[PDB]
Amino acid sequence: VFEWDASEDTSIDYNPLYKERHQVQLLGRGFIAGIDLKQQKREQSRFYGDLMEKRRT
Amino acid sequence: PTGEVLSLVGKLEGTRMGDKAQ
Amino acid sequence: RRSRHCPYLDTINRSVLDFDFEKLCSISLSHINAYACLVCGKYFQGRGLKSHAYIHSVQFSHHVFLNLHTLKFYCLPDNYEIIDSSLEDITYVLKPTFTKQQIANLDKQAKLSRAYDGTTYLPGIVGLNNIKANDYANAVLQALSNVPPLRNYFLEEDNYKNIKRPPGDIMFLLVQRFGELMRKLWNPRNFKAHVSPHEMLQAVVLCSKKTFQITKQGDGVDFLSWFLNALHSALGGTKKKKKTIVTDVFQGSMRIFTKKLPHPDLPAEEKEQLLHNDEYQETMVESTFMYLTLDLPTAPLYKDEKEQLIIPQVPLFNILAKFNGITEKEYKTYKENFLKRFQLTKLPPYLIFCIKRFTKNNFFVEKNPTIVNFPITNVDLREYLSEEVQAVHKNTTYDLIANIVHDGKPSEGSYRIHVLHHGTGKWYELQDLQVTDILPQMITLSEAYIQIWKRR
Amino acid sequence: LLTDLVDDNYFYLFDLKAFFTSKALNMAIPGGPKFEPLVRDINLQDEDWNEFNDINKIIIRQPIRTEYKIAFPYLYNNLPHHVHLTWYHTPNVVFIKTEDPDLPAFYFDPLINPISHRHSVKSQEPLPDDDEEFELPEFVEPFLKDTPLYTDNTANGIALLWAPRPFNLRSGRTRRALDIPLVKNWYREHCPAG
Amino acid sequence: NVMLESRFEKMYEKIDLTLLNRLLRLIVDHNIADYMTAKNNVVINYKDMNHTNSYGIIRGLQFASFIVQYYGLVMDLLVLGLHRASEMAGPPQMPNDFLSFQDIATEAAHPIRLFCRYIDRIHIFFRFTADEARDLIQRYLTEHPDPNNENIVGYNNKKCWPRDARMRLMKHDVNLGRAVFWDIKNRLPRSVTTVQWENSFVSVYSKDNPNLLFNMCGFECRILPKCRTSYEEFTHKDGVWNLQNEVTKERTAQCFLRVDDESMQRFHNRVRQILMASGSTTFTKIVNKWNTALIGLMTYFREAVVNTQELLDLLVKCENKIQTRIKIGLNSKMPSRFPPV
Amino acid sequence: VGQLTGMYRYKYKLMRQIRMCKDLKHLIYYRFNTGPVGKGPGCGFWAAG
Amino acid sequence: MDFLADLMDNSELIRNVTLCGHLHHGKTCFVDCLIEQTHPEIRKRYDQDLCYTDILFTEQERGVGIKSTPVTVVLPDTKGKSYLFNIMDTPGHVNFSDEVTAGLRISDGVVLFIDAAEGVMLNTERLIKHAVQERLAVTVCINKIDRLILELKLPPTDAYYKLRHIVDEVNGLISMYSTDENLILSPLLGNVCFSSSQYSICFTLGSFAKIYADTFGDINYQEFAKRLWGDIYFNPKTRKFTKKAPTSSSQRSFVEFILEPLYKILAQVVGDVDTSLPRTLDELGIHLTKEELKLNIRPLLRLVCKKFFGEFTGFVDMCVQHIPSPKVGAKPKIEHTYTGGVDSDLGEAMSDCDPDGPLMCHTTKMYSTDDGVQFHAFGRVLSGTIHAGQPVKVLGENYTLEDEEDSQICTVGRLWISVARYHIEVNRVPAGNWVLIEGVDQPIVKTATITEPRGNEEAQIFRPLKFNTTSVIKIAVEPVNPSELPKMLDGLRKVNKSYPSLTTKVEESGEHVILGTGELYLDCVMHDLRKMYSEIDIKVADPVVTFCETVVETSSLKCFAETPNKKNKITMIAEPLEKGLAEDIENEVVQITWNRKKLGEFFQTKYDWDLLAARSIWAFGPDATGPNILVDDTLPSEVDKALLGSVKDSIVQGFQWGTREGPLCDELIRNVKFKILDAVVAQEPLHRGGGQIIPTARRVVYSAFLMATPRLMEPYYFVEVQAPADCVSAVYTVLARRRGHVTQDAPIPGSPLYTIKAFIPAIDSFGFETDLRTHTQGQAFSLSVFHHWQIVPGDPLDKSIVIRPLEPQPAPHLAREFMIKTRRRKGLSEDVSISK
């Protein structure tokens, strides 16, 4: 079998907490390897960006 | 169409044993 | 000060008292200040306010308790001591203290000891309770308990006490528990006709480093040898004494004439020159033996022509033909053969024979069923001593005292034991709770495994 | 090519120890891999309904998950043979690397919560009266006054402190190009959602 | 309600000839009995080795079965007890059926409610009140104390069922099963026969246990009363025997059937010896042997295949084995798209 | 390699490599082709295989 | 080496101090740095920490401290005098708080490690509170100062702001618990010490001023330090210290002279090793070889800080100046700890800490060797000298001057001083030290008082070790092979000795339950049991918390019980206790040892009770500090008082037993007020005996409790989670799933991390740490500590509810389930019998 069967999947969870893993913002300045920085910037929730702009004097 | 015999576990539960017999 | 007026002596029921159990609280599992409820026999934390004994007294209305470590009786709901003579039997059951006169009189004792349940028994010969199919240990201990000098040494606590022990020593726990168990065995006022060696088995497991387990049915010979060596090692000061009790009871002196053998596939001249090379010559080595290993001869392996399928029988003297210069024994070591011939030097006062069964062959382990024919009344061993050492010895006559027999295949066997009562001369065979009187005539009609002999 | 992870607390139950535990316990972390049982124990896998594991006696409020058993190998599972204890929580290494070069190396970034120094109780401590007795020699100075507080390399070095293994060493040895897995840390993280 | 199914371990090879002769003279003319007993004492031969069978009986004698049955009857008198036997057999003038009683009073008088013997597999079905069970447990534990609760270790259970369906090893129920087995073992002398615990199954239905598990004639059966733990009395499942009371005429119990593991092992062994003994054998002979084995299994174990999915897998596997053997017989190379015609 | 060569036909344990390499591809592409770059044959990160 | 033993002779040159703090606050690293300073041959690896003072396999593998470890070591002082220090390396995890207390009881002083970046956190607050309870000397060390430089890059002014805020918070917390104002903490006072244990930085104001002095000379480091903190500024025009800034943009003295040099010395090592490091290294006199300059940033920084700051004299002089020696600090220890008090002759003898006085040691620690079959005691010698190979008389926790049963005579073999992993054997140990004792393991169970036999027969014991938290988690433990049950039983004893707060209890059904504080505590306990003590396979039941029993309404009618003699009739009523009053009894606010006037005054004044009712109070609940009250209410117009006093004691034991084991949940009646409304005492003494009255008292207590509508109290854990801002919303949902209500969410000052404090049911708190850590990808970490019992939803006496198996029942059913299954775990009956 060249490909892999879908039955081999281990990340099957009935718990929504594990189904929806809270993504790490990495202090709003870190970036996960591989993904282009622009896509992550426009994808990140920008909670830290909002906090920074609120605390920007 | 392989010619191999398939296990009827989880199969043909819509049929009884006394059917297809008079 | 209301002692000697306890209205609760009637509630005491000696039938439900099993003091063989480990003295730990039934709830807290604590060893400190063990207190047994005489109504139920279960141990508790101790005498005090808001303690397990107090809770049991106020719950189940049990008013009499006994302090395991103190040998004194108390009442918990009223919390006062008890000083009575009627309770002394319970104290002796818990802590049998044997005086010197009674210890000596055990050899001449000939009265049928009566238990509380009415099952009259004999001192020493008391049924041992098997727990998890380990009857080999019970048989070995029963055989060892029949030795008079060992009985004298271990019956009184202070005889083997008052010695220096290593701070990290746990072997003394086993040696001091053997005395407790054995003085329970020889106690003539037991509530029950049998004795539970479960605490002794637990101590054996604790000190043996997981060998001789309660679950596994280990070899009697190995267990006996390990027990004797361990008992010798424990006793004495921080440094081993030359002559411990086990040494003077069982150890003897024996001589080995070890001669190296050349390779049998060698030229005759080369073999002779190797023999002359002083390497393959006889060497004398003295040693101390706790017991003598008896090598049973080879089985016939074929049916007898006249009376087919006859069990082999060998006289005791043919086995005793070892330990002399006339007979050798070509030990077929995997590296090279050795020509070792033995010779006895100094016989011990008590002799232990171990008939080698359960010999592992090239593929598995099989049990030799050859039976040994011996005179139970007496045997002569003066003929198996060298002329140099026969001047010192004066008593070489030995009479059989204990006999061990293994019944069944090595995979699953039963260890039965016959013991000779000194007082009456009767032989008693005991297997687990079963105890029966056996005639001495058919003692030799069994697969003898370990024999204990007395020089008298 | 580098995952911007400061500490290993991300690999709580997703590291070597947790995977060894999962392999030993015949179970698997959701994100983790599935192994064959370490020992078959086909008959021993489903024990009888004893009075000790009586489901009637068991109070259920939240299911005991695989992660619970792996995190506490000696508490939620029976017979943990050849099991590895996962490293517990390391201190949260909160390190805010600089983003704009035109900024001091030491700076109160808005990410850090404001202290907002309160004075509900006027800070009073035993200190002698002002400028009355003590006068230092003129030659006694702070240890580093000539040296500037931070050069242009200070922020870069501070960033280099909390960097992956190859990029936090001043010197090092040489490894073959074969021995350099450029995406080993790529699959050692959790799979992205969607 | 506690069931004990076991077997006399060596009833064939541990029948004394003198006792058998004496017991047969009780029922048949002494000449016939002496002839049969002497016939059981003949020389057993094989190749170059022969011996004199003097202790055991020879199962190959044509009348031997009768002997065994008669001997089994004696064993029943040891287990049931003559009075209870007369309570189950009934009056000699009006004997009862296989499982029936003259009246409810004699049915409820004694704990032993049902009992069958087959050839050597005894199935006993006791009913016990609380006091009777407690007294039996106390009597058993008096001579066999178990402070460490070790009675649960050596307890055979029908692993073929799920955990809930399987017997629940409660301490009281395990102790009661051990006590019942010890009580039955006490009645039988240890020399005339023997009953070994590990080759036995004791299953008790009580408050804790909702299912009664038993095994007979290669059938693993489980009874679930409808009163307690039967949310649905469904009908589609054909491995279910809708047990009906003869008075209420209602579905009081549900009977789940299964093919015993020993029967599956025997069938697999038969197919294996069919296949391995086919080096020089016509294909038609192999197919006929397989067909005979299959009809025997399916007709004997009908309604019990459906619940034994392992049996379905074994059946299709063995059928594929037969087809593979035939295909290898045709050509020494596996066909890729072989047709079933 | 399996499609181009098919060397697994003479040693099936080699499939262990192939199933790995394909996996690495799925590890790389969905990181490579994430943003404005769409799915296509443009990746050249061949170090892993 | 001999000087180490000889220094024990002087009772002033020894300091008994315990190092306590929150989880992972550098305590172990600090002890490693001290060891490296004092042991030349011991050096940590460049990347892996030294991990010294942690000898358990679990300690290294988990990374969390488990067992408090003793470290005896000689350290030079700032002036240059070699003092002797004994250190309790205590676990920072809250679940091992008991392990702190065993080392806290025998410790004169406390060094509180607080992480600079983290803040105070929960275990630090609990630790300072509890140390205030023993009235120990308090010192604070803000460790991990580098995290304000190398992690947050806070400006030195903001760094001073953060340090001052932390110090003020600690001082306010202490002032909220300790009445004595002398416990104020300030670096100028020598209380607060700054440190970064990874890079071997350890300095106080005095130490840094002395460094300045040795750099220049003729500088009074004490007076210089006394002006090196606060709103003080420095003027270089006049070289003068003022209370106002000489300029507008001037910096404070602490920033100017302390924080600034540290910032620059770190920056020149982390950023400019090859460019500017040699210049500043030659400037400060630090001479590093060419090879030494080739190390990585962290080992090089540690090396340069070791060369610069030199010895750890700041910690040494802090402990010397603020932590009293045993000779002088023994008096409060005897006042608070010993049961007999300082008034007695033994109290006076042991207060002086006389090496020649009566022998007295207090053992509170048990240590397992490699075998694990022979434990070693560890404790403080409070008077006299213990000698190797000497007979001693060991007392027990229940020993009193009357009961001599709890004692035992044991021979002490070789004894040693434990320096973490290695211990130095010594022939004897004088007073005030910490000693390992051999040969006394068998009679010693947890707390132990050891004295000499054939003398000082009027010797009592010290008060039992009191723990901050109430262990509520309970796990049943069984052997896989019952034939090997005794071994596991043996192992149980061992763990019961090893863990001070472990409670092993055998229930009626035969289930051996073990009481633990939290998940990690029981995990380590069972790992030790399986792998070190028992060495056999074990089985665990599903974890469950204990439950308490209370009432919410007055008993409908007075419930009466009678003795089997049918002559003593006791009729009682049931009511709940007032709010806080149960907590007052829990915290020993009011004690039964108080004379009746004081306790009556407390009850009548603070809680508005009747004066007669306050004087009518008989006893407390399950123990002397039980949260239940037993109050007389027999009217003198009908019931004689003197006659009632004869059976008052027996009724007291009966009520205590009834409160110990509740009718509903088989244990722990809590927050219940019982009033005896009628007493008919038989006129003869033999008809009112304890064996007759106590069961009757239990029955009447049960009837009164059950007649009033009972309720089950489940323990609520107070869980605070330190997490980044983005994870707060996720933590809210995770806490909402497990029926937990959120109280506070405060962002930590000087750090971008929030801290959310909430209350979660302990029965629903299992796996909460793992859930939260994995759900937020390790960003949110949680610690759980017992907070308070709270009424569980549902009615335990509503039989119309049906309990569905293997299903999480709704709240109105929970109570019923929570008792019924509990009864099944005890082997008890299905339903509570009101008649019985």
Numbering used by the authors:
A (entry chain G): 273 to 329
B (entry chain B): 36 to 57
C (entry chain U): 100 to 555
D (entry chain A): 245 to 438
E (entry chain A): 974 to 1314
F (entry chain A): 585 to 633
G (entry chain C): 116 to 951
What did the original publication write about this model?
Here cryo-electron microscopy analyses of human CE pre-B complex and B-like complexes reveal extensive structural similarities with their CI counterparts.
The antiparallel orientation of the two CE pre-B complexes in the purified pre-B dimers suggests that U1 snRNP bound to the 5′ss of the exon of one protomer may transiently interact in trans with PRP28 of the adjacent protomer. Furthermore, stoichiometric amounts of full-length MINX are present in the peak gradient fractions of the pre-BATP dimers analysed by cryo-EM. This finding supports the conclusion that the MINX 5′ss that is bound by U6 comes from intact MINX RNA present in the adjacent pre-B protomer; therefore, a RNA–RNA network that links both protomers is formed. Notably, the PRP28 RecA domains are no longer visible in pre-BATP, which indicates that they have been destabilized. This result is consistent with the idea that the pre-BATP structure is formed through ATP-dependent, PRP28-mediated transfer of the 5′ss of the MINX exon from U1 snRNA in one CE pre-B protomer to the U6 snRNA of the neighbouring protomer. Taken together, our data demonstrate that the tri-snRNP of a CE pre-B complex is capable of interacting in trans with a U1 snRNP bound to a 5′ss, which leads to the handover of this 5′ss from U1 to U6 by PRP28. This result further indicates that the latter handover does not require that the CE U2–U1 molecular bridge in a CE pre-B complex is first converted into a CI U1–U2 interaction, as the former bridge is still intact in pre-BATP.
